Design a protein around this nucleic acid. Structure first.
Ligand SMILES: [Mg+2]
Lengths: 85, 85
DNA sequence: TCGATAATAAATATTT
DNA sequence: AAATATTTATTATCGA
């Protein structure tokens, strides 16, 4: 397919918004984007770099530590309170 | 009632995509945006100008004339095939 | 970080 | 008397 119009901030925001408890890991963000948008099933090394960049660079995305029981790869990412949600 | 992250291109694309006929008039685009995003119920004079600019400036949006037997203000807008979706 | 794209703000232009 | 459509420049923001 062709590239959808969504910015990386928009792609991440939509992924978080539909996520159980409005939290998901980086790899879950990757998977949601690829599941919904066939364009992103390729050039993964490039756009996933852009995803990681967008999560860190923008204050609207906030890191949340894993639980001590069921800890794992990466933290959860969520939306900052003074966005819309 | 906070500003959603979506670009004007993304807002228009989403509005058209959800239309039963896959086409919307300009005023229908305005209404869909305002219905879904309360933020856009203000400053309509500004962002609706931006909507019109985005519709004309981008080739992914293509104008479709009303039938001669059903005239009115403005044409229908839809997504062009030569732009993916 | 640097190159690309979006968006704000107009005047202009078309049409009902 | 208006909604709609096109166009240009500039500022802001995005993204490779
Ligand atoms: Mg967007």
């Amino acid at each position: 397919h062709a590239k959808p119009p969504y910015s990386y901030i928009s792609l991440i925001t939509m992924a978080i918004q539909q996520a159980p408890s409005k939290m998901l890991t980086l790899s879950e963000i990757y998977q949601w984007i690829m599941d919904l948008f066939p364009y992103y099933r390729q050039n993964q090394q490039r756009w996933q770099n852009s995803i990681r960049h967008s999560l860190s660079f923008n204050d609207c995305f906030v890191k949340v530590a894993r639980s001590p029981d069921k800890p794992g790869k990466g933290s959860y990412w969520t939306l900052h309170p003074d966005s819309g949600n």
